[PDB]
A = this chain, B = another copy of it.
Amino acid sequence: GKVILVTGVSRGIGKSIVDVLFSLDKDTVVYGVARSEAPLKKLKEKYGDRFFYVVGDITEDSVLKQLVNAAVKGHGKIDSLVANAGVLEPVQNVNEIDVNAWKKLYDINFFSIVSLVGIALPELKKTNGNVVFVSSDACNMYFSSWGAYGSSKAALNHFAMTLANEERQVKAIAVAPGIVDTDMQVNIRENVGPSSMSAEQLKMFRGLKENNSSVPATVYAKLALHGIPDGVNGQYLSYNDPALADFMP
């Protein structure tokens, strides 16, 4: 079966993509990572030795190498990578013009993924594999009031095109999920200060959350399993672009 790495799997669309992968195919193996062990254990308990995980922050290169080494050690190869920064959540000082906070958010949403692709790339070359990015719909970047939360998340869009131009033995695609990726579980509101999210950002964020997926998760899952078509290699698309019709449920 295909060996697929998936990041950001604790919540939101990353969790759904794991769920969908296992329902689509009986042979696929998934190695996931998230920062919290609880939901990784729950996935391991549900899916058994179809699922393996590393716990930690992918802004640590050591965590990335653990995850890549664990897949090659345990199953001998890597077919695909579903590169996902995970759900939107408030991060300290991002609503300020604060280079330290911006660098930290760009490392969460963009550079850790660049680092992971670089680390996994030699295995992906071996299988002529696929890199599927879970990017953001906020390509209305045109106008966006999401500040650094939006620009850092959307940086994967151009990255897909650059990776596919530069590395011809692999394919890459960036797909927007038609929603703002948030934790879907009913949660107590958190006390979020204005240096972290503007009042508007917080109010929309809560609205969206208190409103929120299997359909776009399937698109990502089918691209990772069956491969990216040549005609969309390098591109960034909504999950509902007609060029993706064969990757729908």
Q: Does A193 contact B (CB under 8 A)?
A: no
Which B-chain residue is minimally distant from A165 (CB atoms)? Answer: B145
Which B-chain residue is minimally distant from A103 (CB atoms)? Answer: B111
Which B-chain residue is minimally distant from A234 (CB atoms)? Answer: B231
Q: Does A159 contact B (CB under 8 A)?
A: yes
Q: Does A183 contact B (CB under 8 A)?
A: no
Residues of A98-114 at the interface with B, using a CB-CB cut-off of 8 Å, are 98-99, 102-103, 106, 111, 114
Q: Is the interface of A mostly helix, strand, loop or mixed?
A: helix
How many residues of A are in contact with the other chain, CB < 8 A?
Answer: 66
Contacts of A198 in B (CB 8 A): 165-166, 242
Min CB–CB distance A197 → chain B (angstroms): 9
B97 touches A102 (CB 8 A): no
Asked, given contacts A147-B162, A162-B148, whether A236 binds B140 with beta carbons under 8 Å apart, the answer is yes
Asked, given contacts A178-B178, A241-B140, whether A97 binds B111 with beta carbons under 8 Å apart, the answer is no
Known: A200-B243, A204-B240. 5 other contacts (CB 8 A): A97-B117, A140-B238, A142-B236, A143-B236, A147-B166
6 pairs of residues in contact across A and B, judged by CB atoms under 8 Å: A96-B166, A97-B166, A102-B111, A140-B238, A146-B241, A199-B245
Interface residues, chain A, CB within 8 Å of chain B?
95-99, 102-103, 106, 111, 114-115, 117-118, 121, 137-148, 150-151, 155, 158-159, 161-163, 165-167, 176, 178-180, 198-201, 203-205, 207-208, 211, 215, 232, 235-238, 240-246, 248-249
